[PDB]
Amino acid sequence: QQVIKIGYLPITHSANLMMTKKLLSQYNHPKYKLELVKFNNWPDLMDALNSGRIDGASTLIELAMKSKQKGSNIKAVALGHHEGNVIMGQKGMHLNEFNNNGDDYHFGIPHRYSTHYLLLEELRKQLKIKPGHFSYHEMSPAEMPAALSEHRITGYSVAEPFGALGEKLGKGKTLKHGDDVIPDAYCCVLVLRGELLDQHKDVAQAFVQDYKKSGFKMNDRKQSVDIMTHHFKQSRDVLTQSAAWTSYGDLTIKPSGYQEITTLVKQHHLFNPPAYDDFVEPSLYKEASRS
Ligand SMILES: [Zn+2]
Ligand SMILES: [Zn+2]
Numbered sequence: 017q018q019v020i021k022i023g024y025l026p027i028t029h030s031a032n033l034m035m036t037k038k039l040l041s042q043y044n045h046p047k048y049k050l051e052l053v054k055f056n057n058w059p060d061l062m063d064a065l066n067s068g069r070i071d072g073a074s075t076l077i078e079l080a081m082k083s084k085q086k087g088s089n090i091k092a093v094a095l096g097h098h099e100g101n102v103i104m105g106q107k108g109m110h111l112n113e114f115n116n117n118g119d120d121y122h123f124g125i126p127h128r129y130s131t132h133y134l135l136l137e138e139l140r141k142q143l144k145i146k147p148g149h150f151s152y153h154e155m156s157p158a159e160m161p162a163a164l165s166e167h168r169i170t171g172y173s174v175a176e177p178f179g180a181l182g183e184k185l186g187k188g189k190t191l192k193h194g195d196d197v198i199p200d201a202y203c204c205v206l207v208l209r210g211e212l213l214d215q216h217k218d219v220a221q222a223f224v225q226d227y228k229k230s231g232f233k234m235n236d237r238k239q240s241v242d243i244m245t246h247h248f249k250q251s252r253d254v255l256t257q258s259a260a261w262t263s264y265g266d267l268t269i270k271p272s273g274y275q276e277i278t279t280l281v282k283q284h285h286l287f288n289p290p291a292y293d294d295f296v297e298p299s300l301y302k303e304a305s306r307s
Contacts, residue, residue, distance in 0.1 A: 018219045019049040020212070023061045023073035026054065026248045027157060027175035028100045028262040029204035030074035034243045035230035036223075047222040057156035058127045065090065065209070072208035077277055078129035080207050084290045089210035091297040093224055094231075095269055096204035100262030101135060101194030102179035105171040106164060107187035114143050120151050124160045124172035128152065129287070131194070131203040132173035134280045139197050161185040175203065176258035177250050184254055193261055198280075202273050213297060225304035227267075232306065234264035269296050 024030035033052055040046045053070050055061035058079060064070045066088060074096040084090060105113075114121065125132045133152060140150045153169060157178040163169050165186035172182070182188025194201055206227065212220045234240045240259040245252050271292055278289040289295075 017047070017049055018216060019051055020072070020219065020223055021051045021053055021070045022206075023053045023055055023064055023070040023075075025056070025058070025061065025074075025157065025175075026250075027204075028177065028240075028244065028258050029096045029175045031240060031244050031247075031259075031262070032096060032227060032230050032234055032264055032267070033074055033206075034247045035234050035239070036227045038243065039226050039230050039233070048219045050223070056158060065207070068209065071212055072206065074204050074206055076127055076130045077202050077205045078131065078134075078281055078286065079127055080205060081277075081281065081289050081295060082129045082287050084295050085287050090207045091210060091213060092205040092207045092269055092295055093297055094206045094227060094301045095202060095267040095273075096206055097267075098200055098263045098265070099193070099195050100176050100258070101131065101173065101201070101203055102176060102190055102261070103135060103139060103171060103173045103192040103194075103197070104160075104164065104179045104182045104188045105191040106167070107189055109171070109189055109191065111143065111191055114145055116146050116149060120149055121145075121170040122151050122153060122168075124155050124163055124169045124174070125152050126157055126174055127154055129281075131198075131201050131277070134277075134284070135194050135197050135201065136173050137284060138280075139192060142197070161188060164188050176261060177244075177248065177254050180254045180257040181250065184251075195261075198276075200273065202269070202277050205269060206267075213300075221300055221304065224300040228301055228304040228306065231264045231267045240264070268301055269298055 037050050065073050157174045160172045161182040241256050244255045274292050281289045
């Protein structure tokens with residue numbers, strides 16, 4: 017039976033894929049096989065997606081949009097989650113520390129095309145700090161705690177559990193949750209390569225359907241923690257904190273939410289974003305039953 021390979025990073029934004037996998041194991045005869053392929057950074061994951069070594073992936077929405085603007089055959093079918101993003105600073109730092117008086121502040125981000133960059137820029141404006149006084153440095157999420165503890169950066173923005181890990185692993189302080197900066201900003205989405213939708217629609221629909229059911233199971237916090245402790249190289253305390261600030265449920269990619277990201281990408285001249293109908297294929301998730 018048809019194997020679907022889906023790529024991910026071990027962050028809460030991809031945890032609904034783990035739940036989907038667990039649910040699929042409960043059928044006597046599942047309609048497809050789900051292979052979850054792990055990556056440590058975003059560029060490696062996108063290369064596997066673009067070369068077809070994986071059939072889909074949970075990925076940064078801006079990164080996927082840029083790839084789409086560059087001719088990618090992918091389509092976003094659902095959100096991976098709601099919230100679950102943080103902005104970390106060095107130990108004992110206060111938001112009032114930031115000013116226009118001295119040297120520039122250095123922030124780690126997972127990729128230049130990320131909601132993390134947008135969150136930080138919005139926080140910069142809310143703090144009335146001049147443009148260019150925050151400098152951004154791309155790095156893998158797992159590398160951020162060490163970069164922070166060893167003062168190569170002032171702070172960072174990333175999906176949990178990499179903020180909670182910063183607090184545990186040495187010295188990091190949670191300055192802000194994404195929620196406090198841009199309420200319900202979309203971050204990661206489940207994207208599928210176009211051929212799955214065109215050529216294996218029954219399998220694609222079955223997969224999104226299991227994914228949809230899983231999304232609602234994940235509202236129960238005990239479950240989201242249990243799913244993650246199983247799959248991720250993190251302790252239960254780090255993952256309880258991580259799960260507490262992430263939500264799932266209705267994972268529809270809504271036009272309004274998508275439009276917010278396009279506005280922000282356009283506003284920072286990142287790239288010209290693709291229209292909703294060219295990037296998003298919301299039929300699979302809408303037709304899938306909640307039950
Ligand atoms: Zn991330
Ligand atoms: Zn994300």
